Amino acid sequence: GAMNSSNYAELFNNDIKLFVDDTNVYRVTVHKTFEGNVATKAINGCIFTLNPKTGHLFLKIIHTSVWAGQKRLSQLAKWKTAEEVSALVRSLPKEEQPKQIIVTRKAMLDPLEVHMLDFPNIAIRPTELRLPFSAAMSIDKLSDVVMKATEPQMVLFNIYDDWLDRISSYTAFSRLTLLLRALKTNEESAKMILLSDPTITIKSYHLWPSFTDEQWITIESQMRDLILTEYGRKYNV
Amino acid sequence: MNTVPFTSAPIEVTIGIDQYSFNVKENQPFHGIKDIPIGHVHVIHFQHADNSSMRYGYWFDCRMGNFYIQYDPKDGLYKMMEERDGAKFENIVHNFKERQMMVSYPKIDEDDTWYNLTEFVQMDKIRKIVRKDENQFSYVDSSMTTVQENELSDPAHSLNYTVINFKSREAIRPGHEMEDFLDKSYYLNTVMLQGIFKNSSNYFGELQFAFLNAMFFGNYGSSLQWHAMIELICSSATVPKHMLDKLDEILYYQIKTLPEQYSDILLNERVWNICLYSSFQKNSLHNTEKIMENKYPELL
Numbered sequence A: 001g002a003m004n005s006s007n008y009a010e011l012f013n014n015d016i017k018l019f020v021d022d023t024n025v026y027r028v029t030v031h032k033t034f035e036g037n038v039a040t041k042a043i044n045g046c047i048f049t050l051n052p053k054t055g056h057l058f059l060k061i062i063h064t065s066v067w068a069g070q071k072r073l074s075q076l077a078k079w080k081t082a083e084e085v086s087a088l089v090r091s092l093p094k095e096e097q098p099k100q101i102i103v104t105r106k107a108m109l110d111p112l113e114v115h116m117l118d119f120p121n122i123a124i125r126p127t128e129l130r131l132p133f134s135a136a137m138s139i140d141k142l143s144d145v146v147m148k149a150t151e152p153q154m155v156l157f158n159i160y161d162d163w164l165d166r167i168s169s170y171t172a173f174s175r176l177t178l179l180l181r182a183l184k185t186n187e188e189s190a191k192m193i194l195l196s197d198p199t200i201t202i203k204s205y206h207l208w209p210s211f212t213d214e215q216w217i218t219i220e221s222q223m224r225d226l227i228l229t230e231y232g233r234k235y236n237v
Numbered sequence B: 001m002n003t004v005p006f007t008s009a010p011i012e013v014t015i016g017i018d019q020y021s022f023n024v025k026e027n028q029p030f031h032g033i034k035d036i037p038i039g040h041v042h043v044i045h046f047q048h049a050d051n052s053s054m055r056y057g058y059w060f061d062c063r064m065g066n067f068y069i070q071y072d073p074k075d076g077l078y079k080m081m082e083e084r085d086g087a088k089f090e091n092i093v094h095n096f097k098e099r100q101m102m103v104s105y106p107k108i109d110e111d112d113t114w115y116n117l118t119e120f121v122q123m124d125k126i127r128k129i130v131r132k133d134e135n136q137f138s139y140v141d142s143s144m145t146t147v148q149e150n151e152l153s154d155p156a157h158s159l160n161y162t163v164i165n166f167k168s169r170e171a172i173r174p175g176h177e178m179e180d181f182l183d184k185s186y187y188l189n190t191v192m193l194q195g196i197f198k199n200s201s202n203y204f205g206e207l208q209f210a211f212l213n214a215m216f217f218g219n220y221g222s223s224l225q226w227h228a229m230i231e232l233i234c235s236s237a238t239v240p241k242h243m244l245d246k247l248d249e250i251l252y253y254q255i256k257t258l259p260e261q262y263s264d265i266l267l268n269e270r271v272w273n274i275c276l277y278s279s280f281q282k283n284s285l286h287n288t289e290k291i292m293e294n295k296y297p298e299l300l
């Protein structure tokens, strides 16, 4: 069934599962035409497919050329996501295929279910969590590879860097969601927090800075503070 | 005109014949129904005075034999039976018609209701949905489940309606996932009509049989089947023009005949709002949309 506060720990058991977020697949700028009408111009997008246990991220880059000449693009974006997720599963060895795929928005259920009819033993599930995966394009290296792409492309990341060498996947996913929630609520502040000290760097093969354990506790406290405030600043409390 | 004689009426019961019904008292001198129109299927159905649970009844065609009812006190129900001895049948029926112990099938000469509800229904196809090949008539009741329901448990006592499933490999061609799921014309026209039903008359016939079993027996799986078949048409962009016009008439007479107090359980809000207001065929069911809006605006 649906994923919520109460069945949270299933994410970290040893049944393979993937989160699929489609919120960055179809992305536009809205602008005015010479005649004073409004028009959209599409920009490159991405499917965010994540193994929350391992941290393996399958970033499928959606090049604008896939919208050329198509109508009802928001609807087509959901089926394109499902097609791409399904092709990903099919590309994987059987023992690497997921047993569940959890979609972050309910409109993906029917497109994915139809594309996955061939995999009756893979459960497609929604969630009631308000997960911040839309903020993934606030991660500079992910944003960069998406905007530079000239053709459809899949890029593999580990969105936890090396954290798992020191912390559990429960703790890693909690850190990840805290970081993304912060970036979603106030991107400038969140990014200031992460890079303030120039002596903490991002390895070439990583997405986030090389914080010590002690530095992560401080960072995490600053992200919490940020998030509580922006909630005051927004509701005046 | 034909006759369904009864050996007696030992228990109080409401008897229905087609869209008509009358109350018979315990051990009332009642010997059956006369004047039944030849040329249509018919259904004779029963609700016991004691136990409103289990409405039940028998689909039959009088051209296919001489049929009678007799209450079985072991099994506790009015059973349909066939008298092969045509001479014994004429003689028995004549005597009752003489003693005027039969109610007359009360058709109004203007009234084409029953024809319009059964236009495409044929006994031969009923007998393939209700499998009991020794008899020429078919028993249905409120509790019988459908073949698709048993997949989600007695196969002998099931309604073998054609399985329709919009999220199935049968309905979705590889490489046309989105196309086929948003526009079911492939599934309607090639898979079902051309493939399974052969023609729209067999399709419509199953649709009408499903509705009638939902309405007379409150058979839940039949209502599911009726809605599913409506939805497949309305969700198809490409539908022959003659089928749309006929569907509008079919549904029109179904909605007209539905008991007003039963609409809350027999009508699926989602399917009807979708068919009448969202689907490819939102503008193609004028008669159906007009009667639904005037008679059940609450649902929409």
Ligand SMILES: Cc1cc(OC[C@H](O)CN)ccc1Cl
Pocket (backbone or CB within 6 Å): B005, B006, B007, B067, B068, B069, B083, B088, B089, B092
């Ligand atoms: C009313 C009726 C009764 C009947 O008696 C059946 C008995 O079991 C005798 N075989 C036969 C035909 C008809 Cl139509």
